[PDB]
Design a binder for these strands. Structure first.
Ligand SMILES: Nc1ncnc2c1ncn2[C@@H]1O[C@H](COP(=O)(O)OP(=O)(O)OP(O)(O)=S)[C@@H](O)[C@H]1O
Ligand SMILES: Nc1ncnc2c1ncn2[C@@H]1O[C@H](COP(=O)(O)OP(=O)(O)OP(O)(O)=S)[C@@H](O)[C@H]1O
Ligand SMILES: [Mg+2]
Ligand SMILES: [Mg+2]
Lengths: 391, 320, 254, 257, 256
DNA sequence: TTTATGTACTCGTAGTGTCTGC
DNA sequence: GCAGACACTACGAGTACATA
């Protein structure tokens, strides 16, 4: 009914012409699922016009709340394919996955028999929504290799190593942050439908602060309209600050934000205090010390003190990096003093990057100490083998 | 052993949304949700003791009445909220068919939600997305960082802020007038200063002072409860004379019975939360405080180490 | 308003045991004629249709048509808590939020009254079909269960052949071959051992064994089972209960 | 020779008695006297109290002149009883205030002799004089019936509420799956005297108890054919299992509100 | 050249079950007189000797002396097909880098052939210095395993004090003490439970726990196990067999 | 991805026990 | 009654967090 259903549910898209942005990705998904049967008749021995003939499976990722689930549902329903979804609320263990949709990989829809012309309303389309909520990944990959039904997966972060086996077993379709025009039009329709006034310049800031999360934008509109139906440019900053989303940050972006010269400026420190720097370090405390060390010497410094050269700043940062090494060794030892993490945060990320801050000389490189250490460990093992053999 | 009187913290817990003071906009929005009935999924966050879970309980009581015995499932850290034995519980509760008023839904109070594992929240993602028509969730966590971003993408962010002194004073005066205890404005401002916007701390200090001396005058308040040592540490670190800093250290912390590690941790927290002095100066102050922290944790805890820490802090502060 | 009195809490436990392995949520739709249950598997591949005649109940009183969507695990647990000999009595009030099923003991006096919380099943109703089936073979349930458990150790693919007017079962596949042909077993002396086949067209349908075990698990209720095969429509595994019928719909594999 | 001698007719009796309350209690404080042997032990949560008592008639021979405080550990005690043939005749042996006791696992009646010893444990907690009081109700039902009811109801809720009013026993357990309401009408039978729902009445009682603790109680149902439950609003619940010569109570603490 | 055909499939498996925990691997040495495979544990303390006869275990045809070194885990994995009727077939050709283990069943026509990899060890020392033992004891192996596990559960150190008419087992631990004494009692009606301790000199030796567990693991090899004790000498735990015997050695650790 | 204890969670497995049955 | 079937508790290996 109305007035007793969530705004993000009653205003869900009804067709593929009601999706805000991601027109290319939805179009690609529609083409892939509209030509799977032709690829099946081709026995998957060659690609199609867009390359859909080689991949019997696809996977969707993107930021939350942008329309992956809605696009999947509408694409499955428009062609009549019967939806068969597995979710994180149910078990995806290897034994139960083999005891679950494994038989459904080539069966038929009995409800499709009873429901119904709907020529292709007689098949399963399989939906692992929330793949990241996991030997489940191995079983899913082996399903992707051998499946007699359309199959897609929905996750959020491909870059995680646990979906690494999905590297070339699925037709990747990437969803991005939608452009503000379609969301602007959708909120205009919603505002004129739900009696509350909305100001066009406000949608841009709402999308900017919400970081392209349409569902959270609808929730924000509902919550504001509960007591203050009028949205103007007066309380825009108040609402943006109250509903700001403290999203976690990726290691490369962590290194970029840490090495930016503005945050250590006098003006830039009023809002981005060093407490925010500690909180930013603590997002990924295992990669930030390694990321800072490998690119703190490949920038133009912009916070050089008068009479101080770039090399002096590099040396003074290396001193505190060496101190952070000793702090970490005390942290990860038999004593196991984990109350020392805030000190390691400063000495390993904040102070060394507070002297070499500036634009990149090249670009932020992935940490190489991990690979070098692994190769050194294997070389040590082989050295021990020959040492003991010849002894 | 006579039955104990209920403490004033729990005796005067609010039962309606009107009695909660502070964050007027959030309370008014909660009231509009209460009479409207269209409760969305929300996450409530803030510093401890400012009225997070009491607002959740009051809203759950107001939205649905006699159905409160079975129409709300409350969970907490004392319940073993895991991925496996508990997904079935919320799955059944959301799938449970109970007849409500037309504009009311079942409420799942996942109180203290920042302590759950990642997999539990991953299951809760689709659990919330599926039965959004029947059940609604209410997270109440001190820190919102532990909650994953898919959960934040489908929840209404209700951030509580620390209570202003006026609202704490107003509700305190209400409590005095209901209890009829002799009070002095200096004592009340002492309670406000000691509480630091933590309401339960204010009520507990009021209890201790009332039942310890009868009068809540400022001298009795400072006799019973001590001033917060973060303020003393901030005063000590910001002094200009080294002798003054050493005297403050000794008299106010070493002779008051404060462990050295507590002083070091409080100094680190004050320095990282301080903003008056230059950023770089705070960086070397943090480095030196951390060196003293390593010395303390390695075994040697002595007044001499704290004195050396203060001496080097003054060396950096006075610019050689 | 619903008052379904059973003579003993044995046949209800037996039917719940029979179909509880495959389906996990059912929806009892109670009417004046009796009770009708519609069940869909979690994989949406097999469908269990159950209806019970009013004569099975010792007493059945109803006022309005009311639905009851339950959970098989909780219901089976509550039923197993009660004694087998007792007399079950399903009671539903004006609001179908919970049912009151209670066990009465003739010996002694122990009214182990239980309550079960209902669940909100989706809006999908029953859309039962009447399309013609080409094959209707009806053979003893026990020996059918025995032979299909014998064939279940082979591959999952279980295809049924209607060649040569003779029931021809094949359980071949990747891991091995399980082709075993059975003969009609009509006997004049024993009416319980009789096989009749329509033989309209030798249609070919294949199925899965891991579910077929769940179909054959309900063989205890009826000694007579009849596979009704169609050229296109899904297979039927009907069990003629003493009053109603309990039939399994299985979608053909492909 | 030794001051304390207690030769059981069979090791099976002591094994069963120990396994009756082995799970719910960690530390046991035996107090041997000339009248018999008693054992008052408290659970770790200090909610469930066990008061074992074995009369002198359950021993084939028994002699203990001086009172002995045998504080022990049930885990190691059960481990010691785990090894040894069950048909063998156990003989408890202890010295004058010793550091240990000696378990004579005399195989059959000759040949093999065992000398298993368990170091005595210093439990300074005195025995608690919680014997009985004016109980509001006194019911008596077969152990099998009570065990079956508790096992059935524990799957439905975490708390079992026992209500007695006007010659009727009623167990209710409201939870998430459902709410059991098992009720019992008192009766007596001359044909089978073992099954008889005896009852007494002073004032109605509505006392709730935990599920795990009640399961721990019914684990001991194998010792006695009958179990006697006595309830009061101002007293812990009493579960008197009758033994061959003594008894084994279970003082369970009800929940409030 | 090697044709060590074994009568029962689940017999050599039964032997390697005992061989698994005593030592990680053995170096087989097949001779027409018999099969010997002795290995040294990782501690160089526990000694295992193997002897297999020729009259039983089907016809044994060892044309040439063959020395083979291989693991027991893969051997057990191949021997997992241990049906009560199945047999064994050992074939070693020139350069036997991969022994083919043929399975032929009498009850069914199904056949199974697998190849076992060979590692390069070529190390085997066979020395039996002592045969004279002060006390020789025969007793049922199941009772030995029972008493050893009961005493080793209580304590980590096991000592034996052999005196006149008493075979004393004592185990002192922190939890308590277990002093089980068994007397030599022989029943002619029950040969398996017969106990005889030959008496020349009393033996008092202190042993370990894990070694005793490894010794008693192979309890099913013989109904009666031969236990030999010598003063100031390694112990000898000889397990009998239908053709040959398996003896286990251990150093009596003692620090007083 | 190394880190190097202690904690907590999760799953899987192996038996161990009582419960139905012929 | 012995045999199978059954679901239960107990145990072991693996992963991930560690300051706000
Ligand atoms: N492009 C869009 N246009 C309009 N509404 C949208 C769009 N994307 C999302 N929504 C709204 O957001 C709701 C939920 O979107 P979903 O597709 O379920 O989010 P999601 O892509 O699954 O992200 P996850 O699963 O939470 S990580 C829909 O029901 C719509 O109301
Ligand atoms: N705004 C308020 N108005 C009135 N009483 C309040 C208010 N905030 C807190 N209290 C009192 O604080 C006590 C309980 O506060 P809670 O809401 O339970 O603390 P909290 O907000 O949950 O913080 P944490 O994280 O749970 S420790 C009661 O005695 C309330 O009366
Ligand atoms: Mg989704
Ligand atoms: Mg709270």
């Amino acid at each position: 009914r109305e007035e007793d259903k969530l705004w993000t549910v009653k205003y869900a898209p009804t067709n593929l012409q009601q999706v805000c942005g991601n027109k290319g990705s939805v179009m690609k998904l529609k083409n892939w699922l509209a030509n799977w049967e032709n690829s099946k008749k081709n026995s998957f021995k060659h690609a199609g016009k867009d390359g859909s003939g080689v991949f019997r499976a696809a996977m969707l990722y993107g930021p939350p709340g942008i329309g992956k689930t809605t696009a999947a549902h509408l694409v499955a329903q428009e062609l009549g394919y019967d939806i068969l979804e597995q979710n994180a609320s149910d078990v995806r263990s290897k034994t139960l996955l083999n005891a679950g949709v494994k038989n459904a990989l080539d069966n038929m829809s009995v409800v499709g028999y009873f429901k119904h012309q709907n020529l292709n309303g007689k098949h399963f389309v399989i939906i692992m929504d929330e793949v990241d909520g996991m030997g489940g990944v191995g079983q899913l990959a082996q399903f992707c290799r051998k499946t007699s039904t359309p199959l897609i997966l929905i996750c959020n972060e491909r870059n995680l190593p646990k979906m690494r086996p999905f590297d070339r077993v699925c037709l990747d379709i990437q969803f991005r942050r939608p452009d503000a025009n379609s969301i602007k039009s959708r909120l205009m329709t919603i505002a004129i439908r739900e009696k509350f006034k909305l100001d066009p310049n406000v949608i841009d800031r709402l999308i900017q602060t919400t970081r392209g999360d349409i569902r959270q934008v609808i929730n924000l509109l509902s919550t504001i309209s509960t007591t203050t139906k009028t949205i103007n440019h007066e309380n825009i900053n108040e609402i943006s600050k109250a509903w700001e989303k403290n999203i976690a940050l990726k290691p490369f972006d962590i290194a970029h934000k840490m090495l930016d010269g503005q945050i250590y400026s006098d003006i830039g420190s009023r809002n981005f205090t060093l407490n925010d720097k500690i909180a930013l370090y603590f997002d990924d405390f295992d990669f930030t010390p390694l990321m800072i060390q490998e690119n703190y010497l490949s920038t133009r410094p912009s916070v050089l003190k008068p009479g101080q050269s770039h090399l002096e700043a590099v040396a003074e940062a290396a001193n505190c990096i060496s101190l952070g090494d000793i702090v970490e060794k005390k942290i990860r030892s038999s004593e196991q003093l984990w109350s020392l993490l805030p000190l390691h945060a400063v000495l390993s990320s904040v102070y060394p990057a507070s002297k070499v801050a500036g634009h990149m000389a090249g670009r932020i490189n992935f940490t190489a100490w991990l690979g070098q250490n692994s190769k050194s460990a294997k070389y040590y093992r082989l050295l021990q083998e020959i040492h003991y053999h010849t002894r | 052993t006579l039955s104990l009187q209920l403490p004033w913290v729990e005796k005067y817990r609010p039962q309606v949304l009107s009695d909660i003071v502070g964050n007027k906009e959030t309370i008014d929005r909660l009231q509009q949700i209460a009479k409207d009935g269209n409760m969305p999924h929300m996450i409530i966050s803030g510093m401890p003791g400012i009225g997070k879970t009491t607002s959740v309980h009051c809203l759950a009581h107001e939205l649905l009445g006699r159905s409160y015995a079975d129409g709300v499932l409350e969970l907490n850290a004392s319940d073993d909220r895991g991925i496996d034995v508990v997904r079935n519980q919320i799955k059944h509760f959301a799938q449970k068919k109970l007849h409500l008023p037309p504009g009311k839904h079942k409420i799942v109070i996942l109180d203290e939600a920042d302590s759950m594992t990642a997999g539990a929240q991953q299951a809760l993602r689709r659990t919330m997305e599926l039965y959004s028509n029947s059940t609604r969730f209410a997270f109440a966590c001190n820190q919102s960082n532990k909650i994953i971003e898919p959960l934040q993408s489908r929840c209404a962010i209700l951030r509580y802020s620390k209570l202003s002194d006026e609202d704490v004073l107003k509700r305190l005066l209400q409590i005095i007038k209901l209890e009829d205890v002799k009070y002095t404005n200096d004592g009340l401002e002492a309670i406000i200063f000691t509480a630091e916007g933590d309401m339960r701390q204010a009520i507990n200090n009021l209890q201790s002072t009332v039942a310890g001396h009868g009068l809540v005058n400022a001298d009795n308040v400072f006799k019973i409860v001590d001033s917060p040592h973060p303020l003393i540490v901030k005063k000590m670190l910001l002094a200009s004379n080294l002798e003054d800093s050493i005297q403050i250290l000794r008299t106010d912390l070493w002779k008051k019975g404060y462990s050295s590690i507590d002083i070091v941790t409080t100094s680190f927290r004050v320095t990282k939360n301080l903003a008056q002095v230059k950023e770089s100066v705070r960086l070397e102050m943090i480095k030196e405080i951390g060196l003293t922290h390593m010395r303390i944790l390695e075994g040697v805890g002595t007044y001499l180490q704290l004195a050396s820490m203060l001496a080097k802090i003054h060396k950096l502060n006075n610019k050689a | 308003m619903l008052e379904a009195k059973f003579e003993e809490a044995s046949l209800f436990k037996r039917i719940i045991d029979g179909f509880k392995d495959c389906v996990q949520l059912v929806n009892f739709q109670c009417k004046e004629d009796g009770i009708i249950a519609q069940a869909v598997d979690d994989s949406r591949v097999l469908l269990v249709s159950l209806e019970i005649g009013v004569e099975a109940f010792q007493e059945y009183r109803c006022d309005h048509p009311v639905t009851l969507g339950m959970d098989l695990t909780s219901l089976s647990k509550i039923l197993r808590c009660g004694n087998n000999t007792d007399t079950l009595t399903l009671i539903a009030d004006n609001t179908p939020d919970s049912i009151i099923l209670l066990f009465e003991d003739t010996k002694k006096d122990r009214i182990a009254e239980y309550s079960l919380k209902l669940m909100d099943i989706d809006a999908d109703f029953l859309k039962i079909e009447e399309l013609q089936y080409d094959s209707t073979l009806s053979l003893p349930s026990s020996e059918f269960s025995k032979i299909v458990r014998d064939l279940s150790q082979l591959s999952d693919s279980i295809n049924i052949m209607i060649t040569k007017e003779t029931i021809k079962f094949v359980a071949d596949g990747d891991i091995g071959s399980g082709s075993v042909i059975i003969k009609p077993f009509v006997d004049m002396e024993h009416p319980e051992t009789s096989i009749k086949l329509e033989m309209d067209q030798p249609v070919d349908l294949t199925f899965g064994a891991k579910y077929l075990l769940d179909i054959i698990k309900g063989s205890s209720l009826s000694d007579r089972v009849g596979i009704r095969l169609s050229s296109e429509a899904p297979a039927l595994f009907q069990f003629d209960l003493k009053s109603g019928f309990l039939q399994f719909f299985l979608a053909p594999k492909f």
